[PDB]
Amino acid sequence: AQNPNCNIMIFHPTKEEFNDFDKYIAYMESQGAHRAGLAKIIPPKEWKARETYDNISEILIATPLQQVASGRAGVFTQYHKKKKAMTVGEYRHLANSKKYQTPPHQNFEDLERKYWKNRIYNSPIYGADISGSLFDENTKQWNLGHLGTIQDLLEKECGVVIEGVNTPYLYFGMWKTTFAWHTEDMDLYSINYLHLGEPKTWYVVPPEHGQRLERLARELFPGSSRGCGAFLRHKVALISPTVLKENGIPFNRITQEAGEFMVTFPYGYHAGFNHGFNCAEAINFATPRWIDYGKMASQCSCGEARVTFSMDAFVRILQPERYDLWKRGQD
């Protein structure tokens, strides 16, 4: 069995290997990459996403979100307070302001220590889930707006034609902006490209051990767990690496830098934070191997999770027994 310790693997495809996306995901899995829940892919030196990032300042962040924490430094939740619209140029100036800018630090490990010590005492503002793309239309390799759609994959594997679309999303981050512990909708894959700016640190639990994380989370967030049997789908809970180690939870960590892709695998729980002003693009995707994970994905039906239009068909076809309860949580 490849990668039995579930380490995060890093890949360096050649320009030829970068042509066929599906084939390279299957190759990474042949080497055991999915066992980690997360892999890094460094593009060949010949590749670029677009020519420059000099002309992005007029993109609008319609609903910036202030991430307000509650709890203790290593075990906390966050809620998202809506703020007034602002452009990417305005957001970049805000991220660089004395109130929000990255502090002086020695290296990534020092900054990680500072994050976990001090995150809860600040409320950073995040631009999230902005439909759009920064890939040039002429970039033919690993262009996250030109991937095969999840609806087409389901139709190819299972024969059922369904409604829905699958488009990318942009993220604009600052120091201490935080992504809570979660798996993807319907335990899909994700891919994330860091277009520009400062790094993103990731934490991940191997898919084979995800239920260990879920059990700790029920212990640590006992009111939330009573409220909903899949409350991690709410995407509000944080647990630090120190707390995970104290509780024996298997996990790994890695820092993504600008120009690098990350792939998350089905049922790989992940969380992380941004180092300073940055912009990422991400989308969900599927392969044949996903279908069995989609069929078994937990679901939130309490009302909190609310998700895209295109999840309806996935639940309807893959999880007909759960569909009526889930749709009620949508309504």
The residues that touch ligand OGA, with contacts defined as CB under 6 A, are 171, 179, 190, 192, 200, 264, 270, 280, 282
- The letter for the amino acid at 274 is N
C-alpha distances out from residue 230 to 168, 217, 220, 298, Å = 25, 10, 14, 6
Q: How many CB atoms lie within 10 A of CB 311?
A: 20
Give yes or no for a contact between 100 and 173, defined as CB atoms under 8 angstroms apart: no
User: Residue 257, SS3?
Assistant: coil
> Which partner, Ni ion, ligand OGA, Zn ion, none, binds residue 280 by CB below 5 to 8 Å per kind?
ligand OGA
Three-state DSSP at 152 gives helix
Which among Mg ion, Ni ion, ligand OGA, none contacts residue 9 (Cβ within 5 to 8 A by kind)? none
Shorter beta-carbon distance to Zn ion: residue 156 or 328: 328
Q: Which residue is nearest to Mg ion (CB)?
A: 58
Residue 95 interaction partner, one of Ni ion, ligand OGA, Zn ion, none, beta carbon < 5-8 Å per kind: none
Assess contact for 171 and 208: CB atoms under 8 A.
no
* Residue listed under structure tokens 């309860």: 325
Indicate the residue among 6 and 282 with the shorter CB distance to ligand OGA: 282
Candidate segments 96-104, 186-194, 251-259, 304-312, binder of Zn ion by CB under 5 A = 304-312
Tokens describing residue 198: 């400062």
* Tokens (6 digits) for 143: 């262009």
Q: 92 or 178, CB closer to Ni ion?
A: 178
Nearer to Ni ion by Cβ, of 86 and 187: the residue is 187
Ranges within 39-58 binding Mg ion (CB under 5 A)? 56, 58
- To which H or E segment does residue 278 belong? strand 278-285
Tokens of 318: 């893959």
Query: Residues marked as binding for Fe cation?
Result: 182, 184, 270
CA 97 to chain centre: 26
- Tell the smallest beta-carbon distance from residue 280 to Mg ion (Å): 17
Q: Give the footprint of Mg ion on residues 56-75 (CB under 5 A).
A: 56, 58-59
- In the window 188-227, what residues touch Ni ion (CB under 5 A)? 190
Distance CA 222, CA 200 (A): 29
Contacted entry of Ni ion, Zn ion, Mg ion, none for residue 42, CB cut-off 5 to 8 Å set by kind: none
Among 291, 302, 307, 317, binds Zn ion (CB under 5 A): 302
Please check whether residue 264 is in contact with residue 203, taking contact to mean a CB–CB distance below 8 angstroms. Answer: no
Query: Least distance to ligand OGA from the beta carbon of 192, Å?
Result: 4
State the residues that interact with Zn ion by CB under 5 A.
228, 300, 302, 304
